[PDB]
Design a protein around this nucleic acid. Structure first.
Lengths: 83, 141, 57, 221, 185
RNA sequence: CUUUAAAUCCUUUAACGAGGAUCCAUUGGAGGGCAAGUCUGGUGCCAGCAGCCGCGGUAAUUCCAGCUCCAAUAGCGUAUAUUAAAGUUGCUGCAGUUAAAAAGCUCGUAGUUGGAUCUUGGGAGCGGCCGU
């Protein structure tokens, strides 16, 4: 994607599944990009920033998207480790 | 392949060798029966002597009369119905004439409307039938 | 119908026209030049569709 | 003559907020407005009607001929689309297929054979595409090779802006529809083939639905 | 048993599809531009390029600093550079693939005789070559295929012997001057 | 003149040698595949064309000709062997429910294929924890 001179030449760099790393093609309409809002650790209100997640349509059709967001929010601290 | 053994060279070669005989184009070329029963004996062309001029009824659909020429080949003594090309070229073939005769185009298979005629007449009395049709050479009599 | 008697029917019975007098066609690179001039230097962008060389609709 | 955009993504593109169909292709957005793809690649999009195909529904009183028009569209700079519209007469089919070709357009990733210098000339890697019986394999080739293909996938790959390529084709390639849909499907998978180049995890930027939410409320419903 | 050579090879390949509109009309675009006479004169150049372009593919498979590659590669590069097709600035053999038919048509004698401006067209140029009016370093060249070496470009002028130079004035003028004094009396 | 055993051809070179530059480019085509006429006259499932699909029974884009256009071009067509195209012989690489195809079933010898496991840490040295 870079030339002998070191220039980024490909006309866009794709997104790819936050679960299984599969690049998310231009016409994958099943693909789900989520914004998960974070909170002030004593007030409990929307700060203004989010932990954005992106799943390829394929894992979403498998039905594993649920567990894959649940993992990405646990290892992100959004969700209780105890659970 | 259905035996990917490293020491399976002969099974793979000896299978292929055996299964090449189930091909038509191979079985034809690699037996005498196709080269023997060939009226031309494996030759491209063949001089023969006209013994009658024959109307052959065209196939089912289209329906003309195809003017062919019954030929005794010199080399074999074998019998051939050979077609005569373009419009009014059976008028150039006197009986008992030595004609040079080629295939029709499909490697000894019957062509178009003409049932079991595999041959065309090329030259008549060693004068080319295109040259007679175009009127370039006149028939030496 | 038509036995061996009808051989060369239609070839015989055409009004036999003699060929017209032509200024003889130039041959070699003089021809390929003339072909190049008919196609790539002369003609204009046309509305709808570009026609064939022998076209006479 | 004037475009009044109906969909959300169409509204943004007319109001200049998002300016590259690259940015649309990143969030994998459906493109349903026709003028979006006519807006960003407009002064380059060229049409070739690959085939008009008379199909026939047999009815009580004789055949009912409709006409399929297969239209490949693309700039010669990394975007192709393959539209097939079946209609009553060929004028309507060709026009409708042009619109469907536009709506279909994908980006083509193109790479190098060996020496990564200059601009990419060929397919980045061996990609295969299927439709019915047809299988169209693409292999990268060195510079000046051209497209080594049948007249149908040549017309697409040239329009894709792929300068060099070795193709293979298996199955009934005589069915131009499947043969054009396979080679289009093969091209499509260039930005769906994970190379080492794209191993660096993505810095998830903001959707133009999220980035320009404040504009969309007052401009349309 | 005889003392004859026999060694001879074709200088062209006939293309697979005989009626590609895109090819037929790109090869006539070449013939017009550069005043060649048939598609064999185009398939001849295309074939030489394809053999060069085959040899280049063969050397790019080989490891860098391979003795056969470095020798063979530089030998190919200095040849293309010497005929004015490739640059001394760009002599690196991945550029040999980025090289096409117009680069070889530019170096043939017909096109140099035209683009030096001592001919009036590309068709006039062949006439001047065919009718042995032009020379290269005191060598009268009859043949418009003649690929001009880069050093040997500037030494293209008229023959000393031709009436365009300081030569014996030709057949038509000399007959018309003799008819002119036969006309005057 | 040169060439050469002696000649020839080539090269060189006096003189002649071109306007219809008659010092006259053919060969095959023009429905699709396949580049190029829905032109005109003839024939009327006849004559014939047509590798295949097809054209021919009175507006023949296909026959027989005229003009025209296309293709290759001092060459171009045809028949036949053969190679690629043929991933339609398949090692690379085909197939075997229904398109051709898995033995009725099992044992069984040559053939072919065959589980895991048997040495590693550091000594010497350089470049900016990793390299030879």
């Amino acid at each position: 994607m870079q030339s002998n001179a070191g220039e980024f030449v490909d006309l866009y760099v794709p997104r790819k599944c936050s679960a299984s790393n599969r690049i998310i093609g231009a016409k994958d309409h099943a693909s789900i990009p989520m914004n998960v809002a974070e909170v002030d650790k004593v007030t409990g209100r929307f700060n203004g920033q989010s932990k954005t997640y992106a799943i390829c349509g394929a894992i979403r059709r498998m039905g594993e998207s649920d567990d894959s967001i649940l993992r990405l929010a646990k290892s992100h601290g959004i969700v209780s480790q105890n659970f | 392949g259905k035996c990917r053994g490293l020491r399976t060279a002969r099974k793979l070669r000896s299978h292929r060798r055996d299964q090449k005989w189930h091909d038509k184009q191979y079985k034809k070329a690699h037996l005498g029966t196709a080269l023997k029963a060939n009226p031309f004996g494996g030759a491209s062309h063949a001089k023969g002597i006209v013994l009658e001029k024959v109307g052959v009824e065209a196939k089912q659909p289209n329906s003309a009369i195809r003017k062919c020429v019954r030929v005794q080949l010199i080399k074999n003594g074998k019998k051939i119905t050979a077609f005569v090309p373009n419009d009014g070229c059976l008028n150039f073939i006197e009986e008992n004439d030595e004609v040079l005769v080629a295939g029709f185009g499909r490697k000894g298979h019957a062509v178009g409307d003409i049932p079991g005629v595999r041959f065309k007449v090329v030259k008549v009395a060693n004068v080319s039938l295109l040259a007679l049709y175009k009127g370039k050479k006149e028939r030496p009599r | 119908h038509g036995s061996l008697a009808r051989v060369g029917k239609v070839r015989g019975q055409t009004l036999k026209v003699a060929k017209q007098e032509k200024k003889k066609k130039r041959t070699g690179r003089a021809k390929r030049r003339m072909q190049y001039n008919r196609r790539f230097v002369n003609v204009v962008p046309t509305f709808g569709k570009k026609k064939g060389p022998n076209a006479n609709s | 003559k004037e475009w009044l955009p109906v969909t959300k993504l169409g509204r943004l593109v007319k109001d200049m907020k998002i300016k590259s169909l690259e940015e649309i292709y990143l969030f994998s957005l459906p493109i349903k407005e026709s003028e979006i793809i006519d807006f960003c690649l407009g002064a380059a999009l060229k049409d070739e009607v690959l085939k008009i195909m008379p199909v026939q529904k047999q009815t009580r009183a004789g055949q009912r001929t409709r006409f399929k028009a297969f239209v490949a569209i693309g700039d010669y700079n990394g975007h192709v689309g393959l539209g097939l519209k079946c209609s009553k007469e060929v004028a309507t089919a060709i026009r409708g297929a042009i619109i469907l070709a536009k709506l279909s357009i994908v980006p083509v990733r193109r790479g190098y054979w060996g020496n990564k210098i200059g601009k990419p000339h060929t397919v980045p890697c061996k990609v295969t595409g299927r439709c019915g019986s047809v299988l169209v394999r693409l292999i990268p080739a060195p510079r000046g090779t051209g497209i080594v293909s049948a007249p149908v996938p040549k017309k697409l790959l040239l329009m894709a802006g792929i300068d060099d390529c070795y193709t293979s084709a298996r199955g009934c390639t005589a069915t131009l529809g499947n043969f054009a849909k396979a080679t289009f499907d093969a091209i499509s998978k260039t930005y769906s083939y994970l190379t080492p180049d794209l191993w660096k995890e993505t810095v998830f930027t903001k959707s133009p639905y999220q980035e320009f939410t404040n504009h969309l409320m007052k401009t349309h419903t | 048993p005889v003392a004859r050579s026999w060694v001879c090879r074709k200088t062209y390949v006939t293309p697979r599809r005989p009626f590609e509109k895109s090819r037929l009309d790109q090869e006539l675009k070449l013939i017009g531009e550069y005043g060649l006479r048939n598609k064999r004169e185009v398939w001849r150049v295309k074939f030489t390029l394809a053999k060069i372009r085959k040899a280049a593919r063969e050397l790019l498979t080989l490891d860098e600093k391979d003795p056969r590659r470095l020798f063979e590669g530089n030998a190919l590069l200095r040849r293309l550079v010497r005929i004015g097709v490739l640059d001394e600035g760009k002599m690196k053999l991945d550029y040999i693939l980025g090289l096409k038919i117009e680069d070889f048509l530019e170096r043939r004698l017909q096109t140099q005789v035209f683009k030096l401006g001592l001919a009036k067209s590309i068709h006039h140029a062949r006439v001047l070559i065919r009718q042995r009016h032009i020379r290269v370093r005191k060598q009268v060249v009859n043949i418009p295929s003649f690929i001009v070496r880069l050093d040997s470009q500037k030494h293209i002028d008229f023959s000393l012997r031709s009436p365009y130079g300081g030569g014996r004035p030709g057949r038509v003028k000399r007959k018309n001057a003799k008819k002119g004094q036969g006309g005057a009396g």
